[PDB]
Amino acid sequence: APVLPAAFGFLASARTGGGPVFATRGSHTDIDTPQGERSLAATLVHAPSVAPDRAVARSLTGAPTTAVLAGEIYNRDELLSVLPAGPAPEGDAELVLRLLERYDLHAFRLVNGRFATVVRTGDRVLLATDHAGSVPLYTCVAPGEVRASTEAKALAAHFPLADARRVAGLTGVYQVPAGAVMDIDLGSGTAVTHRTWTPGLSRRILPEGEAVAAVRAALEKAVAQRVTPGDTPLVVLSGGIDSSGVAACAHRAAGELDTVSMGTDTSNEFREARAVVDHLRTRHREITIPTTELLAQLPYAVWASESVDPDIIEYLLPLTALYRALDGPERRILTGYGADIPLGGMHREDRLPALDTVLAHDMATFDGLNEMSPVLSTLAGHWTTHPYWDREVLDLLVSLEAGLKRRHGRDKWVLRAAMADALPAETVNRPKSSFSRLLLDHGVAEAKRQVVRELFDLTVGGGRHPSEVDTDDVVRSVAD
């Protein structure tokens, strides 16, 4: 069975004085509160098949301390190597606690993972995200009261924070920045934010051979860290080098591999994916979803991503549909998402300047889009992780000089070359609107924001389940 994180998300609170609803599907467990209202209270959302235990750690080092962690840590061996004594932590929450005892908040500068965590030590509260904030974390801060959650909707049902961004569509709710740690004084309700990672701005030079081998090694490691020892993972397969590169690495680390490809009545990438399916001999499945059913995902996409950006929602529609269409038990899924950002995959010309311009811009503006949120798949009970945005892989891909990304007249060159000896030639060299038409059949060409914002106000700001939101009637009201 596919091992899943000890927890997918949570709603926590720290107070001195005085019904959690999540988009994430799964069980709920409230942790114990030893010292009453002085303890960190919290409700964890997790898979019915996992015990929440590993997601919660307690200690008395420094003062009464409690840590709750959603997600997982990948560079575990590295982290264990810098700790004293011998008895290793039982889970990632305890590992964080051990690191905090040694480096304090600087512990987070060392972590390569996919997590969100809240820690209470005495009357001090720490809120931390992974380097890319791949697991969203939100908070409400006021003198003597701190509430944190992996879903803004859990805080909407209920003092402006500097350095943090206000959740669009909501009031009083802030999103913790990616790659950061907020150090909050419970008493005064004052917070200080420290960034624990930032995109590299310099570029590195390497001969083709070394560069290709470095990318291959990095991807293999990030994928291996993401696959359970003896369990077969599921990879969302597309017709590009992105997902195919991940599949080759997962198949090697696991020995076997399950794959799935989604298509619509408008298009699909089944033929391209089949080449990889047969080359690696994986257990493949094809899912085709009508355009109509695809647009019916609108309410769920905004509900799960908690985004009001139409472009983001439009991109996530096919993904949310696929995850919900998956049949069988809960699964650990790896995807080829985000490879285009650091590699400038959307760059078409051979002139390198524009490639770096767009790359630098993308890397300084990814935070807040929530494109990699686990909720996109956990709403259906599935756990997703993305190798290309692994901290080590990401740093390496970003650092490479543009000539290694656009070389020999091919995009994402270093990646293609890195997987050449593990995939068919066609897959390696293979190069690379309903929603707009829906409204096109109602209003002037001239917009969608109001449509998405409406859904957001109903599902995120309000409190209505997507199944209770008529996607048609919403667009109806948005006529003129």
All domains in the chain, ordered by first residue: 2-199 (3.60.20.10), 200-476 (3.40.50.620)
480 is in an annotated binding site: no
Query: In the numeric block, which tokens belong to residue 226?
Result: 């993401």
**Type of residue numbered 27:** S
Query: In the numeric block, which tokens belong to residue 326?
Result: 């998956």
The residue among 353, 354, 316 whose CA lies nearest residue 335 is 316
Q: Cα–chain-centroid distance for residue 61?
A: 31
242 is in an annotated binding site: yes
The residue among 323, 390, 317 whose CA lies nearest residue 130 is 390
User: What is the Cα–Cα distance from 115 to 110, expressed in whole angstroms?
Assistant: 13
Strands 145-149 and 9-15: antiparallel
Q: Identify the helix (H) or strand (E) that includes residue 474.
A: helix 471-477
Question: Strands (DSSP E) along 74-189, which ranges?
Answer: 113-121, 124-129, 138-142, 145-149, 165-166, 174-175, 180-185
The residue among 192, 59, 167 whose CA lies nearest residue 119 is 59
**Type of residue numbered 318:** P
Under 8 Å between Cβ of 152 and 463: no
User: What is the Cα–Cα distance from 236 to 215, expressed in whole angstroms?
Assistant: 21
**Type of residue numbered 229:** P
Catalytic residues: 337, 371, 432
Which DSSP state fits 400?
Answer: B
User: What is the Cα–Cα distance from 398 to 354, expressed in whole angstroms?
Assistant: 15
> 281: left (phi > 0), else alpha (psi -120 to 50), else beta?
left
User: What is the Cα–Cα distance from 248 to 73, expressed in whole angstroms?
Assistant: 22
User: What is the Cα–Cα distance from 350 to 348, expressed in whole angstroms?
Assistant: 7
For 283, what's the count of Cα atoms within 13 Å in the CB-facing half-sphere? Answer: 7
User: What is the Cα–Cα distance from 80 to 367, expressed in whole angstroms?
Assistant: 29
Under 8 Å between Cβ of 123 and 185: yes
Resolution in angstroms comes to 2.0
The residue among 43, 52, 40, 39 whose CA lies nearest residue 5 is 52
User: What is the Cα–Cα distance from 299 to 332, expressed in whole angstroms?
Assistant: 24
Query: What Rg, from alpha-carbon coordinates, does the chain have?
Result: 22
Under 8 Å between Cβ of 181 and 196: yes
Query: In the numeric block, which tokens belong to residue 249?
Result: 């690495």
Q: Identify the helix (H) or strand (E) that includes residue 45.
A: strand 41-46
Which DSSP state fits 39?
Answer: S
Under 8 Å between Cβ of 280 and 252: no
User: What is the Cα–Cα distance from 161 to 193, expressed in whole angstroms?
Assistant: 10
- Sequence-ordered list of residues with C-beta below 8 angstroms from that of 161, at least 6 positions apart, any chain: 139, 141, 174, 182, 191
- Long-range (24+ apart) CB contacts under 8 A made by 393-397 are 393/218, 393/219, 393/222, 394/131, 394/132, 394/342, 395/200, 396/214, 396/215, 396/218, 397/215, 397/339, 397/342, 397/343
The residue among 296, 289, 292 whose CA lies nearest residue 474 is 296
Largest CA distance in the chain: 69
Under 8 Å between Cβ of 438 and 475: yes
**Type of residue numbered 119:** V
Q: Which residue has the tokens 């009545």?
A: 265
Question: Strands (DSSP E) along 130-220, which ranges?
Answer: 138-142, 145-149, 165-166, 174-175, 180-185, 190-195
The residue among 319, 246, 231 whose CA lies nearest residue 280 is 246
- Structure determined by: X-ray
| Residues of the chain immediately before an interruption (C to N > 2.5 Å) | 18, 158, 432, 446
Q: Identify the helix (H) or strand (E) that includes residue 406.
A: strand 406-407
Helices (H), 307-379: 310-325, 340-343, 352-363, 375-378
